[PDB]
Design a protein around this nucleic acid. Structure first.
Lengths: 63, 60, 131, 49, 107, 49
RNA sequence: CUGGGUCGGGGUUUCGUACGUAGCAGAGCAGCUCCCUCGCUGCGAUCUAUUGAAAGUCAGCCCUCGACACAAGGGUUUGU
RNA sequence: CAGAUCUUGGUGGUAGUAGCAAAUAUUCAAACGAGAACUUUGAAGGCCGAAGUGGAGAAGGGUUCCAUGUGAACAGCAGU
């Protein structure tokens, strides 16, 4: 088994979970749930969203 | 007892719809035997009934 | 061996799927999946990697107005691997092919589902990236 | 549970199985954290401490 | 004793889960009367009108999730009834609902 | 309830040979029973008695 | 076997960062200055810190052994 | 008189069944009272939202108007 980081968050995706979406220019992305699903498909910037790992790392929150 | 008669007279005397008339709730006995506009006109001046104010409608 | 584990069939007869090669077509109009025996009152469905007859409705005037075999490359219905990842691409797709199982064009744009590349090796030769 | 009547001899029924991952994330929602000791390490301290 | 009076924190979000919208607040009342009758045991429960305002305050479609209730049993203290006992429910407003117990109170 | 599992598989010839697979399973909790009684059955032309 | 009932607590989980306060933040405008001048006071959508905060969480989720009272009762029957 | 889809009168099975679903919605306390889901007062929550579930008229009704009282009958449950 291999764990694949989400493309809209940083939460680890264990092998049974999630779903994978591959655009028509040659890139696969992992999504942990449907909340992270239709956030990316509406292009909401993954670092302006108050719970992703990227946002919490950008403001250095907890560090 | 049927305080309906007293309610209609308390509307005509006060010149207001009977929504606003407030027959006193603790004194339903003394109102019950006041059934002529020579007493309800008296029964107001002693405060045993009053006219409720209009519900606020603020344009603020 | 010849395993083709069930993948959720998501293109019933009537599906219009973007052509993905350089033959000059732009729309495949599925008429009937190939290999389906069916039941009373059920439209045949074409999964990913299933030969399916198709009539180009917009493109080269040479190609239009006749029935050409086709293969479905990318399907929009989320299908499951046999390891629990539900891969689903961005659009329906296809490619014209001979009934001998080999391409007509020579340049496929976009990715190709791994289910196809295992089945039609001729397609897997020209695939840009087997996603 | 009852031991079987139909004797099995096929390939599929004579399989020797060694697991690799008994998943244990919560079933009470879309779980994302296998174990609490793992959950607190990705989150960190909270206001409830 | 038999004039014992004590607080409670009636949770009226778990006695209501699964009812229609126009029958939500009127159902909250009966789930209070089914509370006094189970706790004290007397079959006369007299909800004070201040409470009826406090359970209709939001609306009828939405009722406060937790309501704080003072179950003051009485011995026909100020009345006379065929039943010797009856509990007079009352309202005890509070701004928080965390770490509150069902403590007793002076009679 | 139910939960996942992950294992290899070694069916020769399968397109899934020597790869991971995930497979939905149950969990049947089985505490040890306790024997209390014995019963004896006799064959009768009518049936079992 | 002490029993379950209620309230509270934590675990999970949903949504996404509350009121309040502070900021030399904030596109501007207005009023006052030993006219000093990021000077002082105001309005200002929003953003930042307190803040993965706030809130809901079994009514068909889990564990408590913490508070509370209650708990062996009442009615109808049946005989070789 | 056994009949005529016979005339008049009467009673069944159906049957304590179909049904009392058009227009958002009621709740708490008190009073007379034998009796209260419905009457009256008070508190709260709703609607009709000025082309009204408002305030007056013409046709038409003919005493329904107002007061005191009644618990046969009617107000398709009830009713002070």
């Amino acid at each position: 088994m291999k764990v694949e980081l989400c493309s809209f968050s940083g939460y680890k995706i264990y092998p049974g979970h999630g779903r994978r979406y591959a655009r028509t220019d040659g890139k696969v992305f992992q999504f942990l749930n449907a909340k992270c699903e239709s956030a990316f498909l509406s292009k909401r910037n993954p670092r302006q969203i108050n719970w992703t790992v990227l946002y919490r790392r950008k403001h250095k929150k907890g560090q | 007892s049927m305080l309906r008669l007293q309610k209609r007279l308390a509307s005509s005397v006060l010149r207001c719809g009977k929504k606003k008339v407030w027959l006193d709730p603790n004194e339903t006995n003394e109102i019950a035997n006041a059934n002529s506009r020579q007493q309800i006109r008296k029964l107001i001046k002693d405060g045993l009934i009053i006219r409720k104010p209009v519900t606020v409608h603020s344009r603020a | 061996s010849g395993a083709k584990f069930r993948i959720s069939l998501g293109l019933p007869v009537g599906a219009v799927i973007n052509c993905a090669d350089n033959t000059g077509a732009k729309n495949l109009y599925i008429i009937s999946v190939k290999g389906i025996k069916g039941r009373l009152n059920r439209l045949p469905a074409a999964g990913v990697g299933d030969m399916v007859m198709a009539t180009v409705k917009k493109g080269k005037p040479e190609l239009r107005k006749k029935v050409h075999p086709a293969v479905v490359i990318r399907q929009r219905k989320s299908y499951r691997r046999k390891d629990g990842v539900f891969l689903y691409f961005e659009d329906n797709a296809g490619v014209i092919v001979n009934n001998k199982g080999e391409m007509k064009g020579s340049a496929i744009t976009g990715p190709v589902a791994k289910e196809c590349a295992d089945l039609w090796p001729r397609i897997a030769s020209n695939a840009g990236s087997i996603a | 549970l009852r031991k079987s009547l139909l004797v099995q001899t096929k390939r599929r029924a004579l399989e020797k199985i060694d697991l690799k991952f008994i998943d244990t994330t919560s079933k009470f929602g879309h779980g994302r954290f296998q174990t609490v000791e793992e959950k607190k390490a990705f989150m960190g301290p909270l206001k409830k401490d | 004793n038999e004039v014992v009076t004590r607080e409670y924190t009636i949770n009226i979000h778990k006695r209501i889960h699964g009812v229609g919208f126009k029958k939500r607040a009127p159902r909250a009342l009966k789930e209070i009367r089914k509370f006094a009758m189970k706790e004290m045991g007397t079959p006369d429960v007299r909800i004070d009108t201040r409470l009826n305002k406090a359970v209709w305050a939001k609306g009828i479609r939405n009722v406060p999730y937790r309501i704080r209730v003072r179950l003051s049993r009485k011995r026909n203290e100020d009345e006379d009834s065929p039943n010797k006992l009856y509990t007079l429910v009352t309202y005890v407003p509070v701004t928080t609902f965390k770490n509150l117990q069902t403590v007793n109170v002076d009679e | 309830g139910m939960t996942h599992i992950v294992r290899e598989v070694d069916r020769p010839g399968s397109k899934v040979n020597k790869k991971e697979v995930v497979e939905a399973v149950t969990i049947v909790e089985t505490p040890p029973m306790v024997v209390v009684g014995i019963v004896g059955y006799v064959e009768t032309p009518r049936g079992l008695r």
